[PDB]
Design an enzyme around this catalytic site. Structure first.
Site, short mmCIF file in Angstrom:
data_model
loop_
_atom_site.label_atom_id
_atom_site.label_comp_id
_atom_site.label_asym_id
_atom_site.label_seq_id
_atom_site.Cartn_x
_atom_site.Cartn_y
_atom_site.Cartn_z
N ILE A 1 21.37 8.64 -21.43
CA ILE A 1 21.72 7.29 -20.99
C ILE A 1 20.47 6.60 -20.41
O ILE A 1 19.54 7.23 -19.89
CB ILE A 1 22.86 7.28 -19.96
CG1 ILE A 1 22.62 8.22 -18.72
CG2 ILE A 1 24.21 7.57 -20.64
CD1 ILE A 1 23.66 8.07 -17.63
N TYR B 1 20.87 19.55 -13.17
CA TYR B 1 21.60 18.37 -12.73
C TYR B 1 23.03 18.81 -12.40
O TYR B 1 23.58 19.76 -12.99
CB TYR B 1 21.52 17.18 -13.73
CG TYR B 1 22.44 17.36 -14.91
CD1 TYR B 1 23.78 17.00 -14.83
CD2 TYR B 1 22.01 18.03 -16.05
CE1 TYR B 1 24.62 17.20 -15.92
CE2 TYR B 1 22.86 18.20 -17.13
CZ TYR B 1 24.17 17.81 -17.05
OH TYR B 1 25.02 18.07 -18.12
N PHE C 1 33.20 16.61 -13.03
CA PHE C 1 31.96 17.22 -12.52
C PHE C 1 31.27 18.20 -13.49
O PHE C 1 31.78 19.28 -13.84
CB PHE C 1 32.28 18.09 -11.32
CG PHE C 1 33.23 17.48 -10.31
CD1 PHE C 1 34.62 17.40 -10.54
CD2 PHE C 1 32.74 17.09 -9.06
CE1 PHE C 1 35.45 16.85 -9.59
CE2 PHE C 1 33.60 16.58 -8.08
CZ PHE C 1 34.94 16.44 -8.36
N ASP C 2 30.10 17.83 -13.98
CA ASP C 2 29.43 18.55 -15.05
C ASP C 2 28.07 19.00 -14.54
O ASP C 2 27.35 18.24 -13.90
CB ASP C 2 29.20 17.64 -16.24
CG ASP C 2 28.20 18.08 -17.31
OD1 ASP C 2 28.40 19.18 -17.84
OD2 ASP C 2 27.22 17.33 -17.55
N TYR D 1 27.56 4.29 -19.98
CA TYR D 1 28.37 4.22 -21.21
C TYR D 1 29.13 2.94 -21.40
O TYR D 1 29.87 2.86 -22.37
CB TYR D 1 29.28 5.43 -21.33
CG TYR D 1 28.54 6.76 -21.26
CD1 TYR D 1 28.07 7.36 -22.43
CD2 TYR D 1 28.33 7.43 -20.07
CE1 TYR D 1 27.36 8.54 -22.38
CE2 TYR D 1 27.65 8.65 -20.01
CZ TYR D 1 27.16 9.20 -21.19
OH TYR D 1 26.51 10.41 -21.16
N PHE E 1 24.64 11.23 -10.13
CA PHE E 1 23.96 12.47 -10.47
C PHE E 1 23.06 12.96 -9.35
O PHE E 1 22.46 12.12 -8.66
CB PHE E 1 23.04 12.34 -11.67
CG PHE E 1 23.71 12.11 -13.00
CD1 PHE E 1 24.10 10.83 -13.36
CD2 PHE E 1 23.96 13.18 -13.86
CE1 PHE E 1 24.66 10.62 -14.58
CE2 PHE E 1 24.58 12.95 -15.09
CZ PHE E 1 24.87 11.66 -15.45
C1 LIG Z 1 29.15 11.74 -23.13
O1 LIG Z 1 28.91 13.06 -23.47
C2 LIG Z 1 28.53 13.89 -22.42
C3 LIG Z 1 28.12 13.45 -21.16
C4 LIG Z 1 27.80 14.39 -20.19
C5 LIG Z 1 27.81 15.74 -20.51
C6 LIG Z 1 28.14 16.16 -21.79
C7 LIG Z 1 28.52 15.24 -22.76
O2 LIG Z 1 28.83 15.64 -24.05
C8 LIG Z 1 30.10 16.24 -24.23
O3 LIG Z 1 28.19 17.49 -22.14
C9 LIG Z 1 27.22 18.40 -21.59
C10 LIG Z 1 27.30 19.77 -22.28
C11 LIG Z 1 28.62 20.60 -22.15
C12 LIG Z 1 27.04 19.55 -23.79
N1 LIG Z 1 25.88 18.69 -23.99
C13 LIG Z 1 25.87 17.41 -24.34
C14 LIG Z 1 24.55 17.06 -24.36
N2 LIG Z 1 23.80 18.15 -24.05
N3 LIG Z 1 24.62 19.14 -23.80
C15 LIG Z 1 23.97 15.76 -24.76
C16 LIG Z 1 24.63 14.69 -23.89
C17 LIG Z 1 23.97 13.31 -23.88
C18 LIG Z 1 24.77 12.37 -23.05
O4 LIG Z 1 24.76 12.65 -21.63
C19 LIG Z 1 23.91 11.93 -20.89
O5 LIG Z 1 23.15 11.11 -21.32
C20 LIG Z 1 24.03 12.18 -19.40
C21 LIG Z 1 22.66 12.55 -18.82
C22 LIG Z 1 22.17 13.92 -19.25
C23 LIG Z 1 23.17 14.97 -18.77
C24 LIG Z 1 24.56 14.66 -19.39
N4 LIG Z 1 25.01 13.24 -19.13
C25 LIG Z 1 26.29 12.85 -18.90
O6 LIG Z 1 26.59 11.63 -18.91
C26 LIG Z 1 27.36 13.96 -18.78
C27 LIG Z 1 28.55 13.45 -17.93
C28 LIG Z 1 29.72 14.43 -17.90
C29 LIG Z 1 30.97 13.84 -17.15
C30 LIG Z 1 30.59 13.54 -15.71
C31 LIG Z 1 29.36 12.70 -15.65
C32 LIG Z 1 28.16 13.14 -16.49
#
Ligand SMILES: COc1cc2cc(c1OC)OC[C@@H](C)Cn1cc(nn1)CCCCOC(=O)[C@@H]1CCCCN1C(=O)[C@H]2C1CCCCC1
Length: 128
Positions: free
Chosen positions: A75, A45, A55-56, A101, A118
């Site tokens: 989410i 993703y 941007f992640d 969120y 995404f």
């Molecule tokens: C709100 O917290 C974050 C949101 C998002 C990324 C996050 C994160 O944590 C800090 O770090 C990703 C990575 C470095 C560490 N990590 C966390 C998770 N697995 N690996 C578990 C994360 C579960 C929550 O995220 C989500 O449900 C969604 C969908 C799955 C991919 C990550 N998601 C996000 O919402 C990203 C977010 C980062 C900022 C820009 C938009 C997306």
């Protein structure tokens, strides 16, 4: 760019048809099966606030992102959207805060009342 495209052209894949999760298929996948609640799902993703401002990417961790569908690990918009995807598919999602969120946000990465974009590639999924 891509967020505005999803606004204009995306399918509303919510049950309530409130435009809370909009989807465009960008690359067609294969097979009749789509992920079912409980499945272990493998994706790449790229994600950002719709404002472009953060941007992640799973590619920055040099590893696929793995989660169990419908288990509260991601989410609501992912549980909804990935359930519609075929193996090999690339899709764009645009997501209102009610399916991400909400009013709380998730600081420092996600502010209050944020819309999210995404691109997701469905790599694989396996039954519990
Ligand atoms: C709100 O917290 C974050 C949101 C998002 C990324 C996050 C994160 O944590 C800090 O770090 C990703 C990575 C470095 C560490 N990590 C966390 C998770 N697995 N690996 C578990 C994360 C579960 C929550 O995220 C989500 O449900 C969604 C969908 C799955 C991919 C990550 N998601 C996000 O919402 C990203 C977010 C980062 C900022 C820009 C938009 C997306």
């Amino acid at each position: 760019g891509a967020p505005a495209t999803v606004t204009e052209q995306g399918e509303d894949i919510t049950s309530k048809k409130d435009r809370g999760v909009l989807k465009i298929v960008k690359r067609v996948g294969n097979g009749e099966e789509t992920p079912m609640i409980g499945d272990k799902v493998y994706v790449h993703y790229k994600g950002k606030l719709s404002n472009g401002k953060k941007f992640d990417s799973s590619h920055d961790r040099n590893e696929p992102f793995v989660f169990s569908l419908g288990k509260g690990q991601v989410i609501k918009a992912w549980d909804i959207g990935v359930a519609t995807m075929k193996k090999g598919e690339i899709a764009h999602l645009l997501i209102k805060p009610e399916y991400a969120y909400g009013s709380a946000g998730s600081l420092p990465k996600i502010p209050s009342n944020a819309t999210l974009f995404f691109e997701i590639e469905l790599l694989d999924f396996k039954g519990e």
